[PDB]
C-alpha cells in the first residue's frame, strides 16, 4: 500500500550537475516526488548565433537527471504553462506501460498532470516527449533527459565488489536539424506550425546540422568545464535520445562502462570508446590518474570538432611521469 510509504521531495538541478542522492539506499522504498515545468524558449546553439525554438523540460537541454533507487516509486508532476503553445507529454524508458507514461501525460498549455510509476529495473534510462504525430520534432528540439535507477546496494564491478563514485555528471548529447535554404544558410521561423514542414524535411536528411553537449557548442568548456582531482572516481552518465553516439575521454578511458546503461549486467572494462545507441543512456566510471585538460567527445571526430559534440574536463593534481613523460621535447634536427 503506497500511502504507507515515505514521500521525499527532490529539488532538481541544472545539467551537467545532479541532485543530491545516496548511492546505497539509507531507507526502504519511497515515493520520490519530482516536479518539472515545460518551457518552450529560444536558444542560441553555436558561436555564429544560430537561434532555434527549443522545447525543454525545466528550461534546459538536456532535461535534468532524476535519481531514484530500484523499487522506489517515481511521482512526477508535469506542468505545461499557458505561456507555451504546444501539447507535450513524457515517455520514461524506465517505466512499464502506457507508452512509458506517454499515453497518460498529454498536457495542453495551461494543464498539469501527475504520473506515478514503479522503478523496477536498475540502470540509466532516457526520458523524452512523444506527442502523437510529432515525436521526432519534439525530441530533436531538445525535449529529452534521463533518469538513473540505482540498485539499492549501489554499483558493483564485474566481480560483484562495490564501486563508489566521488562525483557524477550528466552529459546530454543533442542532435539538431536546423532547416537550411538552397545556399546552405539556416532559415528562421515565426510559428512552429509554419516551421513544421521544413523541420520534417531537415530531419529526413538524417544529417544533423549541430550535435552538442548540454545544449550548445562549447557549453562544457571554459568556466563550465567539468572538474575533478587526481584520484577521484567520476561517473559520467551520457544520453542520446535519437541518434547513436560514441563517447571517448581523450587522455583517459572508461574503466567500467555500461554502454547500454543497465546495471544488472557486468560493466565492460578498460574501454577507449563505447557505443551508446540512439534512444539509450549509458554510464562510464573512471578514476583520474593525471592532471590537466581532457577532452570528452563523441568519437566521430567530425561530429565532435566540427558539429559541436566536445566538452572539457579540468583535472587538478600531481603529474605521474611513470605513466607518461616527454623524453625529448619537440625540437629541431
Amino acid at each position: 500500500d503506497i500511502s504507507t510509504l515515505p514521500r521525499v521531495k527532490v529539488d532538481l538541478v541544472k545539467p551537467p550537475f545532479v541532485h543530491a542522492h545516496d548511492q546505497v539506499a539509507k531507507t526502504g522504498p519511497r515515493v520520490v516526488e519530482f516536479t518539472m515545468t515545460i518551457e518552450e524558449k529560444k536558444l542560441v546553439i553555436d558561436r555564429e548565433g544560430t537561434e532555434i525554438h527549443a522545447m525543454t523540460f525545466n528550461g534546459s537541454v538536456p532535461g535534468p537527471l532524476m535519481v531514484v533507487h530500484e523499487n522506489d516509486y517515481v511521482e512526477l508532476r508535469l506542468i505545461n504553462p499557458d505561456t507555451n503553445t504546444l501539447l507535450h507529454n513524457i515517455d520514461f524508458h524506465a517505466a512499464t506501460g502506457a507508452l512509458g507514461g506517454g499515453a497518460l501525460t498529454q498536457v495542453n498549455p495551461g494543464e498539469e498532470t501527475t504520473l506515478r510509476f514503479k522503478a523496477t529495473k536498475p540502470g540509466v534510462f532516457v526520458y523524452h516527449c512523444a506527442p502523437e504525430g510529432m515525436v521526432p520534432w519534439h525530441v530533436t528540439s531538445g525535449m529529452n533527459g534521463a533518469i538513473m535507477v540505482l540498485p539499492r546496494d549501489g554499483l558493483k564491478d564485474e566481480k560483484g565488489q562495490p564501486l563508489t563514485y566521488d562525483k557524477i555528471y550528466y552529459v546530454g548529447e543533442q542532435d539538431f536539424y536546423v532547416p537550411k535554404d538552397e545556399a546552405g544558410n539556416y532559415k528562421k521561423y515565426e510559428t512552429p506550425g509554419e516551421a513544421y514542414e521544413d523541420a520534417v524535411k531537415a530531419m529526413r536528411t538524417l544529417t544533423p546540422t549541430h550535435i552538442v553537449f548540454n545544449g550548445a557548442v562549447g557549453a562544457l568548456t571554459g568556466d563550465h568545464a567539468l572538474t575533478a582531482a587526481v584520484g577521484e572516481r567520476v561517473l559520467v552518465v551520457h544520453s542520446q535520445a535519437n541518434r547513436d553516439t560514441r563517447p571517448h575521454l581523450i587522455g583517459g578511458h572508461g574503466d567500467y562502462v555500461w554502454a547500454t546503461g543497465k546495471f544488472r549486467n557486468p560493466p565492460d572494462l578498460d574501454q577507449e570508446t563505447w557505443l551508446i545507441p540512439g534512444g539509450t543512456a549509458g554510464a562510464a566510471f573512471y578514476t583520474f590518474r593525471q592532471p590537466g585538460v581532457y577532452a570528452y567527445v563523441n568519437h566521430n571526430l567530425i561530429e565532435a570538432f566540427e558539429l559541436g559534440a566536445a566538452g572539457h574536463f579540468k583535472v587538478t593534481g600531481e603529474w605521474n611521469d611513470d605513466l607518461m613523460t616527454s623524453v625529448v621535447k619537440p625540437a629541431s634536427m
Copy 2:
C-alpha cells in the same frame, strides 16, 4: 552418414509469423528441408503509393524465418522461375564456406539448385542474396531474411536457467533507396538494367528514403499489429541485412537481449534499446506486464516516425496500477 538421418519437410509461413518448431529438440539431428521460390514483383511501400521493383525470397520482404537446431543440416531447394529476369543466389551467415553458399547457388531464371549446410553455431543469422557485382542492389531491393539455429536444449538465461517463449515474431527491417530526381520526387523504371545506375547513385548517398518493417510503412499496424496477452513471454527476432538499427519497445523493455544474436553468449538484461549492426540478426525476450498498445520502433525516431520503421503490439489483459498509474489526470490549473 547423412543418408541415415531423418528428413523433415518444413512448410514456411509469411513474416512476421514463424513456422512450427520445438524449442527443445525432441529428436536427434535431422536434415531439415526447405523450399523457397524467388519472386521479382512490384511492391507499394508507403501511403503515397510509391512503387518499387522488389526482389524477394518467397514473395515477401523480409524473406521467411527458417528455424532449425544446432547440428541439424539445412537443405534448401532454391527456385528461380523463368518469369524472373535476374540471376540470384543465397548467402547464409549461419553457414561455413563458399561465401555462405553464395558461390554454389547462382541460379538463372529457369534454374533451381539445392544446397546443404550444417548448422554448427546457435543463434539468429541473416541470409541474403549476393550475386557478384550486384550485392547491395539485391539486398536493398528486399532480398534478405533470417534463420534461427536454436540450441538443442533451447534458450537459457544469464545464469543458465531455461527461457521458454510462448510466442515468436520475426521483424525484418528494410532500408530502401528509391531514386529521386533533382526536385526530390521518386523516379520510376521499366527495366532494372535502365534502373541500375540510378539505383547505385541513390545507394551511394547512404541515406535511405524509406525504412520499413515487414515490407511497407504501417505493415505491422491495425489488423496486422502483433499481439500478446499480459503474462505471455514473447521472442522478437529482428534483422537488418545492410544497416544498423536500434529496436525499442515503447512502454516495455528487452528483458533478455542477444543484440548480435548468438545464443552461446549470455543475454544482456533489462535493455531499453539495443543496437543490431547491419548484417546481423538479434533477438529480444520480453514478458508483457501491462495491457494496451505498444509501439515497437527503431529508436532513431526520425527513421521510425518519418521513414517508416515502426510497428505496434496490441496486448490484452489486466492493468497493474502498482507499476504505473495516473495520480492526477491532465487538467487545468
Copy 3:
C-alpha cells in the same frame, strides 16, 4: 626505475602485416622502442584515379600496428621531416594523460620528439594525429593506426583457457571525404591551406566518398589478398578512428570477438557481424574450416561494394562436404 629495464628496438612493417612479437611474454617488462616518420604524400585511392593529399605515419594508410605487452613502456620517436608542410602530433588511446600524448608531441616540419608511456591496459587501441583545431581533417586524411597491448600471458577465451593465433593481420578502415563540385566530380587542390575550407564542408556532410581497407579500393585483393590455410587460427585486428564499422567474414564467423577490443573482457562468441565504434579498434579470432575465397567486408554492403570497404582472404586446403555441399548444382527445370 626505468633505466634498469631492458630496451628492445622494434622494426615496423607495412600493414596488413604485423611486426614480430611473442604472444606470451618471454621477458619481464621492457621499454619497447619505436620510430615513425610522418609523410605527407599523394595517394591514388580508387580505380578511377582519384588522388588525395594523404597524411601518414610511416608512409602507409593505416599507420603500422605496434605490439607490446601489458606494463611494458612504449617509447616512440616521432619524426616530422622538413619536406612536410604541416604540424602533426600523436594521441594514443592506450595511454593515460596529456590528451593521449597529443599535448606533448606537437612537431613542426624539421622537428622530432620522443614520448614514453606505460601500457597499463590490455587491448587493441587506436592511435591518431590530433593537432588543435585540425583534428578530423588529419584523421580523415589517413593519419591513424593502432597499437596492440597483449596480456603478459596472451589471449584467453571466455572460460579463461588459452587462445593462440597462428597468423595476425591488421585491417585499417579509412573514411575519406573528397570534396566535390556541384555536378559531383572530385575537386583537386594545390596547398592544403586552399583545400582546408572545402575539406571541412565535405566532412560536414557526414557522407564519406570512399571507405577503404589499407588505403585504397581493392588494396586487399589479388596478389595482396590475405592468406590462410584450413585449420589455421587467424587474428584480425580492425580499426576505425572516426566512424562506425561492422566487419563480417563472408563464408565464416568471428569465433571469438572483442568488438570494442579490450582483452580483460570475455570475447563474444560465434559472431556473424560485430560493431566497432568509430574511435575504436577491435579484434576477431577465427579458425578456418573451408578452403577458397572469402570476402572480408564492412557489412553496410553499400559501404563495402560501392565505396570500397572489402578485401579478400584466399584459403588453401581441403573442402569439407559435411559442413557444406551442393546437393543439386544449378540447372534447368
